[PDB]
C-alpha cells in the first residue's frame, strides 16, 4: 500500500468557474438563534486578475445576504468519502470599525453542514474579527471555538482558510500568508472518521444596509489526502 493526494477541483478564477452552482448551497450561520431571518444566497461574483469579488448591496433587512458558490465532491479512488482531506481557500480580507461582513467555507453531506469555517466582523462600531469553527448542522451544530483575533497580529491581508481531516481530528486554520503562522484549532471529534462528505459551499454575505468589509477570494481547491493505492 502506497498513498497519494487526489485533487477534486481547483478554481483559480482566471476564467469563470465551471463545475459549480451559484446561490444554491448550504449555509451554517444559525440565524434562528440570533433573532435574524433566514440566510440568503444571492447576487454575483465579479472576476478580475485571477480573483473573485463577491457582490452585495446595502439593503435594509434582518438577514445576512451575499453570493455563494458550491460544488460536488465524489469518493476518492479507493472508494471512500470518509477519508482524510484538505479544503483550502485563499482570501484577501480587510475591515474597519464601520464595516460588517462574513464568510463561510463549508463542507456538507446530503445537504447538511459537516464542517463550517467562518470569519466575521459583525459590528459597525468595532473592527474586531472572529474566526470560528463548527461541526454538524442546525440543532446538532457544535461551535468548537470562537477566536477573537487580535488585530495587531491579524492585520488586513492575505490568508489561507483551511479545513483538514486526519481521521477523527478536525483542524481549522487561518494561515497568515503575508506575515507567517496564523490561527490553528484542532479538535478530536468522536466518530468523525466515519462521517462522510459530498459537497462544499463558499458564502460571502453582508448584513442589512451596513457597509461591507473588503473581501476577495483568490483560489479554491479540495483534495483527498493519504489515499491508498496499490
Ligand atoms: Mg487566482
Ligand atoms: Mg466592524
From TrEMBL:
Binding site for Mg(2+) 2: 97, 99, 121, 123, 126
Origin superkingdom: Viruses
Record-listed Mg(2+) 1 binding positions: 12, 50, 218
Part of the full-length chain shown: 377 to 606 of 679
Record domain Distal tail component second carbohydrate binding: where: 4-226
Stated name of the protein: Tail component
